[PDB]
Symmetry: D2
Subunit: 477 residues, 4 copies
């Protein structure tokens, strides 16, 4: 019997007394693995009210004590790593190796954030008035909320709750309805170690109902969400009503520029890895590849072979595959239509391009050639493992085409010339630029997107600061 999950509100699991449930399906087999409540705004309010009641006492605790609580959580996660990884493989459809890395990374990330306890600093500013001290303190926002995507669902729990809790905020999280199981497991760990009630809450439901309440409740100081630009818009519009602060990461269409003087072998490996990450269901990955004439032929051949070797299938029954199924039916179709439109517009299928039919949602790695910068596939977040390629003559062309997008989170370039490198760095309008390596943000970096890719950001010192606000005290004599 598929387990029916409870919500975690005010320090205890609460059994859902509603009649409506939401089935959680294994994207590899389409089987129902669990059910979660079709939560309502009322449920989100209970979690928010509990978070509000606990916040003052939580912020009053010395930062090192909050860090202490965070360390018990990551220790609990490591103890149940394999269990949590299987939950991720099962509901998220990602391969075993990737799931294991996500759990381990999540625990390391939580520990890294806990280390900020004695380090985030306020400032003392010189005043123009004799005998006056201007003291700028860094305070918690209060109650914060997090809306998570189905891509890297476990890690994103930490990416939002760790910085939030460390700085003295309390939080209410809503997992994606497609991947709530790993979040339930995280909540169990929180319950087991005995985190003060109300500090961490987990509400389950749809974005339309629960999600909106998390963004529009007047007691929320900040709503943090990762997902599509479309959903980001809805969240910011809702937050507008109460001047609620937002932190959004809305994905992108990561450009990869391969120059003629590039280490061909290295570039092909980096691009293939980035793109085929989590079947490409990620944003990080290169989704737009620009190769200049001089190395085109060679590059496209190796890339074509590299991708043909990529095997796809059920993550739970095969550990020798580099790709699992897409998240759900809608995702699969969107990819089909986008490849079809691409082909109808002139794109040349050099590999794949035909959705598999049967149990699960699979799309073979696809390589589209003779694509033009104008083609819609170059201006629409894809989803699946599809790699469009465009040739160019000058660096200026490549940079200009990379910047021709409403997204501005990640970018990459491969070259060995000093001026080219510094030119790409200065010219690319992105939150991140990887040079001669694959795309994967460091926990001490700052993952923040330009243009429609987001507002605010995550990770590192700057990510931690998204959860702090200033109080400037003018102390006279």
């Amino acid at each position: 019997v598929p387990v029916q999950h409870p919500m975690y509100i005010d320090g205890q699991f609460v059994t859902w007394r509603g009649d409506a449930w939401i089935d959680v399906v294994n994207p590899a087999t389409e089987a129902v693995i669990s059910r979660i409540p079709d939560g309502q705004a009322e449920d989100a309010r209970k979690a928010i009210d509990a978070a509000e009641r606990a916040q003052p006492e939580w912020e009053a605790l010395p930062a090192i004590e909050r860090a202490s609580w965070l360390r018990k959580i990551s220790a609990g996660i490591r103890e149940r790593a394999s269990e949590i990884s299987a939950l991720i493989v099962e509901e998220g459809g990602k391969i075993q190796q990737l799931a294991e890395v996500e759990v381990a990374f999540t625990a390391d990330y939580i520990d890294y954030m806990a280390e900020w306890a004695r380090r985030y600093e306020g400032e003392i500013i010189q005043s123009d008035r004799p005998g006056e001290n201007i003291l700028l303190f860094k305070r918690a926002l209060g109650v914060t909320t997090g809306i998570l995507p189905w891509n890297f669902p476990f890690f994103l729990i930490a990416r939002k709750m760790a910085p939030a809790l460390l700085t003295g905020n309390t939080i209410v999280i809503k997992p994606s309805e497609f991947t709530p199981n790993n979040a339930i497991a995280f909540a169990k760990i929180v319950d087991e170690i005995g985190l003060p009630r109300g500090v961490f809450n987990l509400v389950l439901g749809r974005g339309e109902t629960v999600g909106q309440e998390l963004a529009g409740n007047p007691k929320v100081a900040m709503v943090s969400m990762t997902g599509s630009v479309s959903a980001g818009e809805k969240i910011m519009a809702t937050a507008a009503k109460n001047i609620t602060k937002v932190c959004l990461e809305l994905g992108g269409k990561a450009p990869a520029i391969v120059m003629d003087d590039a280490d061909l072998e290295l570039a092909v490996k980096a691009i293939v890895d980035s793109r085929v990450i989590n079947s490409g269901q990620v944003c990080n990955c290169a989704e737009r590849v620009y190769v200049q004439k001089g190395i085109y032929d060679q590059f496209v051949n190796r890339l074509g072979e590299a991708m043909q070797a990529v095997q796809f299938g059920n993550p739970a029954e095969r550990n020798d595959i580099a790709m699992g199924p897409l998240i759900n039916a809608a995702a699969l179709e969107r990819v089909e239509q986008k490849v079809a439109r691409a082909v109808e517009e002139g794109a040349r299928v050099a590999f794949g391009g035909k959705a598999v039919e049967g149990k699960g949602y699979y799309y073979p790695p696809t390589l589209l050639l003779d694509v033009r910068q104008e083609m819609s596939i170059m201006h629409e977040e894809t989803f699946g493992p599809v790699l469009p390629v465009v040739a160019f003559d000058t660096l200026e062309d490549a940079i200009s085409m990379a910047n021709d997008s409403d997204y501005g989170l990640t970018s990459s370039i491969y070259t060995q010339n000093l001026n080219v490198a510094m030119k790409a760095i200065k010219g690319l309008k992105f939150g991140e630029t990887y040079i001669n390596r694959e795309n994967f943000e460091a926990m001490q970096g700052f993952h923040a997107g330009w243009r429609k890719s987001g507002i605010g950001g995550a990770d590192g010192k700057h990510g931690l600061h998204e959860y702090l606000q200033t109080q400037v005290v003018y102390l006279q004599s």
Copy 2:
């Protein structure tokens, strides 16, 4: 004949070819002093497109050269100080002394911001990968827009354009339709010194038309606006459509806490000054005064006398007055209704409380006693010069009541006890807390409101950073 103003777009003044104009009235006499175009979205787009065309070349200039341009602007302002001050007195209705201070301060502020040129710094972060350098650069957002309030209209031009231009952004500003003259004067200075075309643009019109385009045009990287919470909501909702970043300062209801051990003389002077600033048409000013029992009687008596001496009248014909008229008819009525509701709810008029009838919009300083924390006047931004007073027993009561508000920009407290001070500091949930002095933010501070008072902030290093975004470069080998 009342002058008809042109807009300043792409380095030149452009004559309005529309049939509709908006009269600009002297709030002291109700006479039409000038007319501005009833600009449309089309006009805002032309300014934005010009700003976009000029931004790359502008950001490419070394920061010290941009600072150089800013210094010519402030030098131009000082040269025309008296002329600009009279424009402010005439349209804003503020007293001569205040107008002169605003112009001088604006010039000093611009110079202070220009000094950041060689000082805003990016960072170099240690990587976990051998031979890798993580470089975090600080880049311009691109095209930014500013929507100004009628309160301190001249200064707010600089508060937004100086930080914006210094960091390499270009800008399009829309003055309040009630106070555009001082903005036209600022534009003339910009034209005279020859600032590169497109860097600074001035569009005129209503919030409904021009303002909305400045917040919803996809080419805008950030919209900065100062005004009412109501208007802030409209702006954030519009920005939501394109995930446009916002910087909002929406005023407040500044609480002042007077303890028994307070320097009575100092406190009364600070509160009266803060409140009667610009006839109280400002947000900074204390709008909620909490006095504890032990010193109540004394405090209320002195405050009552201090306010009775405040004279009001035409700023242009009297330089011996501490107060001018309110901005317009709507403002006057809103104050009347709020005082009437206050009285009907139980408030006790100890002074004033009766709107003057005749040419201009005047409201005498008013003191309301026996007010309860519940009374709507304690939860509604007032406008005019009205001071509600509430008694209390403990510091805990005072702090709790100060925090009982949807606004969280400024606060103040007067005491001589070390623990009380540190307790108020830790307990008050505001962006600013003044201790034993009047409310007036320093240019090197950070004016940023909590809760509904805003998003982001202005002034100092942090204010400058609102106009910067990061680019993290992962340079491998």
Copy 3:
């Protein structure tokens, strides 16, 4: 048989082949507990040469990997806590409770410093030249050395080696000849976990021989030493020869100011604790107490009783004592002479003032009254548990007398008035000022002395930076 210790050079313990040894005596019984080599400059050079050979590979390791090595060390220390604490009790003569706290704190300190790995940052500076990037990196100094005092010998090992190793430096440490056993234990832990050879070295001997080579060898980038001003002078003079950087902490004469409006109970407890810390053999402790007239009588009475209860004796056989013996004979005599001079100059013995005669080196807690700011005892680091008291009328007097010293490390004041507090803060010329609490620096603070108390400092971010130097790269195009 008293064990004869080997030195730890280039990743292995090396047996001393000299004929001269130095006896290490238990200050409580005068019994020889161990022997260490009378090392020579030659020995220090071997350690330095090994440190030099290992430094490039050590700095080349990602910072997180160095932090990883530091964590194995602290984990090793916790595993042998009681063993190490007894070594400290036995040779240092400090009470069991204090020794246990020192070991635990040392392990926590090492962990805290390891956390800086991904956080110390370089900077990116705006240039005046078009297309130029100014990159300021933070690099290791290279080979560093540490000369430790006999007071808190175990902790000081970490205070110098943790920051040094984390930032990529290698180090050579020389323990005080009076307390080398705990250092040998630390070296065993380093050997057991397998820290790369040459990174941590331990050389044994006298300051005249080994110490001087550690300060004057041209391969040393920085010498860090904690001890007396006299020894600090010798070290800086030696370093002068090769322009070697120095980091010195030379103790002090910590002033404590008790106002009339002070929490009498709290103040007496804080002062007694601070002073009687490690029998007063520490610098931190208040060594100059200024009490104003109004509260004098009361304060002196309670302080007198509080000190009379302090029991002294053998730390190893009594766990109900607050004080152990002084480090050695010379220390005991210096205290006697200073109290005698004090008495001969006019000081009034209100308690103690008579050195005990017999096995060990004990001096009873002593209270000297009617002391004048001029008396030499107010301008000479004492050593033992002696508390001189001086009365005063105004805060200005107290501050002026507190600043009348060649030392400027720590200070303290007790009051409840806001202005007094801010006045003391602005007026006291010290590296630290404690208000209404006892003197004990936090690991995230910055323990750095003014005037003759030192050069540079330790702990926190600034302490970590003492081990880093900048490399400014001007990258054109």
Copy 4:
């Protein structure tokens, strides 16, 4: 009649009443242009005592007011630019164009430093104790002293006094006995604008007498000096006596690495300019040139021609020369001997190498080829315009040879390969590394030498911080 200069002590010029004077000679003609007193320790003490008396009131002034005083000084300098430049040309022997740039730069530098007034910040640190605030303030050191070199004598006055005064310190400066005239002019400006007495003092004399008192007087918080390593040693040894902080810049032997893939034209121009700067009497300049085989022949030919065009002569009578005379007789001889030793050791004179005989001290630009890394000329600060060249095969060789020096201030490299650049950056052990451009530090950078090149540093934020020390306040409840 050669003017006899007075000292500037305690806000007024003081006429020297001694019998001994020191002649100041024009290095181009050997004529006596002026005389200064042969000051004694007594004179230095009077200046120091006056600085001490003025410091408290000076530090008590708001920082912006100190910056205001600094701006009057730079404004005064610009007003007398040509007059001051001629003084520099006359006594320093540098060409007119260089002197004019030094004066203008000095005024800009002073203004840049004044801008730090409202920007240097203290910090607020999270505590482990409930209710405690850890406040770290940045305070002035107190009285500081500056010992200036004869190279860039005017600028170095500002490099030390501007940061010192801005942060609240007072200062006593001793110009080089070879170039005191420009310092007298600076003092006149200070007197004319009316800087508070005691804040800026100028004492004249020899290093042996006046210089030593400035480094060894117990009231000096920090001595800052720029000169030779030999003199730096004497200063640090003297400072050691009172644990006085030091800030030393002792020059170097700047290495220049020219790769085969270097922009030959650019490299030759950069090296020739750097080296021939102020006749090479500067440290900045490349003094060790490493050229790899592949481009050797070409590089050496162009460099040889470039240097042959360099004309030398009297700076005052020729404005078409790139080089003036060396500072004095001793300098000239030291260069002769070093070139002679070089030749005797195997060096090949490709140009120059013969000191001119007659009025003045001239040495023609000299190019030495077939020099070996072992040759003493590669390990001895030269002085004059001599360029030794060494060939190499690998980058590793070049880096290793560049690092083979006791000096570590500046370095440079020319290449177009990305990996080479990043490799040189990581491999070069210097305070500065210039890439594809000439050596000239920016005012916002940080000029600080590694190894024997110095201690501490100058310019930018870090340079400003050399004049600040911390006060950590632990405020409990």
